[PDB]
Write a protein that binds this DNA or RNA. Structure first.
Ligand SMILES: [Cl-]
Ligand SMILES: [Zn+2]
Ligand SMILES: [Zn+2]
Ligand SMILES: [Zn+2]
Length: 117
DNA sequence: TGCTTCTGCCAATAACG
DNA sequence: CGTTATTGGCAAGAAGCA
């Protein structure tokens, strides 16, 4: 009982018992619920900040290494995260990387070990 | 106002038996 | 060891700062 279910128009939703946020996926509810329970801790390996989600920790750790995984394909400049990449492409090249063309490249993470695609 | 950090989807990984 | 369960990387918009 970390949740209850709402069903509307046949659509099933999962509701956090603590903050009442709704989720389409039970996986999302559980991932989210750690924020309340802190059953799992995700400590930074370079400082000792601790995160409630594994992905928050990983994004943070990349800031420590300084790796620049995001590369603008228009001019070659590289950026540490999606937001800097996107902002660059929008302001400098007047294009939207969420459009129908691929304007950037996401290099593999090499400054540390995360699972790979 | 401009950085900065904060859930659906499903591939990669793990757990199971 | 291969079948099922779980993890968490990713996008990109939202929210949270100051
Ligand atoms: Cl780099
Ligand atoms: Zn909650
Ligand atoms: Zn850290
Ligand atoms: Zn560029």
């Amino acid at each position: 009982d970390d949740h209850y279910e709402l069903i509307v128009d046949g659509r099933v939703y999962y509701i956090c018992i603590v903050c009442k946020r709704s989720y389409v996926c039970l996986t999302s509810l559980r991932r989210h619920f750690n924020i309340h329970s802190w059953e799992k801790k995700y400590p930074c390996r370079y400082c000792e900040k601790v995160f409630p989600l594994a992905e928050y920790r990983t994004k943070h750790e990349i800031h420590h290494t300084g790796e620049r995984r995001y590369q603008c394909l228009a001019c070659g400049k590289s950026f540490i995260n999606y937001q800097f990449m996107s902002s660059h492409i929008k302001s400098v090249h007047s294009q939207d990387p969420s459009g129908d063309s691929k304007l950037y490249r996401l290099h593999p993470c090499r400054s540390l070990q995360i699972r790979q695609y």
